[PDB]
């Protein structure tokens, strides 16, 4: 099976390097040419760069001239992009992309695809969040049915994961997308609707979980009293 | 060096028909330089649709064909399926041997009926009252089209600063959903009598409410 799988993305800051690879499996690689393209976020798929099959020639886009280098080791069924002098405006998920015919054909289109890796550039550091109960009230209660919830705020990076009751409970829940604040870190809210003549009675606790910097919160969520 | 301009968006109903231009220039199609098209979906990798202005590769169904004439290219799909709401992309050269992607097209396929925002505003926690901050959650869902109007208020005022709202996103049911958030001073939460959080969307406009303990 013909396969390619890229490698080496993450969060880095501005100004510093990070190469990603490009490994090759299910045909013979030497015999074709490979490109790089990337997409950043909100924005269409940009041409980044190439190399021939043979490694004796490559090509750049304007955007990263000079600063991105590609090369192949035609001993290892992969290939590489060097990244220098990385800038916020280069963050986007990268992929590698294979032409369909072999050796020095050109214009060839792109057949095989990998899923690609993402590369984020900022100044943010990594940091766990901080989570309140969003409580259960009049305001937005009996509709037969309440809402209540857990807004998981200011962490870095994405993403977080959450549950409620360990997973048990699985329906009525939904977890709304990050925003991206200004201030480069995310927030993100998770909600669930319940029968409002049990609450007090049935307790609700959410559970989050932020891999990157080895945070797990557990926060039960209870209707006040004012 | 030049450039590919596609339309940014186009529609049409299920079993109809559309087509997807690219137009480009002397520098690149109008130079004998070929066209490929490319059918994404972000979360998955692109896929090759047609290669060489009218070239089919097998496994691409009957339905996408295309064509090109002078400085321009244009994509034909018959039969429109739900299947088949996603991003496409001419590609070309130029004379440098830097392939170029044009803008990209997102079709939409119709048929959807209109759906109206289930909306929910939370105000601060004693929690992060306690911690000297306060942030107002307002969460919309459910809706179709994906397109919303997102305001907010401190009693009558419009209130502009410390307001971050996404852009929606379509669920797995194929509704979309968004959210706001504003920031506020535990002094400005209680020197008010309320806060709203309004949302319009075609033609409809709810509007839901907080105050401070305005218990009893």
């Known amino acids: 099976q013909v396969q390619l799988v890229e490698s080496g993305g993450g969060v880095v800051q501005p100004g510093r390097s990070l190469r990603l690879s490009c490994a090759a499996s299910g045909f013979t690689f030497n015999n074709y040419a490979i490109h790089w393209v990337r997409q950043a976020p909100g924005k269409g798929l940009e041409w980044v760069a190439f190399i021939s099959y043979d490694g004796s020639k490559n090509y750049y886009a304007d955007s990263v001239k000079g600063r991105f280098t590609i090369s192949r080791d035609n001993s290892k069924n992969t290939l590489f992009l060097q990244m220098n002098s990385l800038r916020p405006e280069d963050t986007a998920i990268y992929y590698c992309?294979?032409?369909?015919?072999?050796?020095?054909?050109?214009?060839?289109?792109?057949?095989?695809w990998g899923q690609g890796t993402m590369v984020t550039v900022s100044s943010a550091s990594t940091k766990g969040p901080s989570v309140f109960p969003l409580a259960p009230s009049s305001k937005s209660t009996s509709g037969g049915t309440a809402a209540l919830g857990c807004l998981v705020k200011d962490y870095f990076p994405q993403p977080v994961t959450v549950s409620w009751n360990s997973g048990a409970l699985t329906s009525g829940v939904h977890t709304f997308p990050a925003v991206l604040q200004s201030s480069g870190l995310y927030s993100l809210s998770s909600v669930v609707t319940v029968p409002s003549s049990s609450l007090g009675t049935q307790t609700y606790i959410c559970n989050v979980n932020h891999k990157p910097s080895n945070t797990k919160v557990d926060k039960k969520v209870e209707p006040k009293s004012c | 060096q030049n450039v590919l301009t596609q339309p940014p968006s186009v529609s049409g109903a299920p079993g109809q028909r559309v087509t997807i231009s690219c137009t480009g220039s002397?520098?690149?199609?109008?130079?004998?330089?070929?066209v490929h098209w490319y059918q994404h979906l972000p979360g998955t990798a692109p896929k090759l649709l047609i290669f060489?202005?009218?070239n089919r590769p097998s496994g691409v169904p009957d339905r996408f064909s295309g064509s090109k004439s002078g400085t321009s290219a244009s994509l034909a799909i018959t039969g429109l399926q739900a299947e088949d709401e996603a991003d496409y992309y001419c590609?070309?050269?130029?004379?440098?041997?830097?392939?170029?992607f044009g803008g990209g097209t997102r079709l939409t396929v119709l048929g959807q009926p209109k759906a109206a925002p289930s909306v929910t505003l939370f105000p601060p926690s004693s929690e992060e009252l306690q911690a000297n901050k306060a942030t107002l959650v307002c969460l919309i869902s459910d809706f179709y089209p994906g397109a919303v109007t997102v305001a907010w208020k401190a009693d009558s005022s419009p209130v502009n600063a410390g307001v971050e709202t996404t852009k929606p996103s379509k669920q797995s049911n194929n509704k979309y959903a968004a959210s706001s958030y504003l920031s506020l001073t535990p002094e400005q939460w209680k020197s008010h009598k309320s806060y709203s959080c309004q949302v319009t969307h075609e033609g409809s406009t709810v509007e839901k409410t907080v105050a401070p303990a305005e218990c009893s």
């Open positions: 992309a294979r032409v369909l015919f072999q050796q020095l054909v050109l214009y060839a289109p792109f057949d095989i």
């Open positions: 002397n520098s690149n199609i109008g130079a004998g330089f070929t």
């Open positions: 590609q070309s050269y130029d004379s440098s041997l830097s392939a170029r």
């Open positions: 060489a202005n009218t």
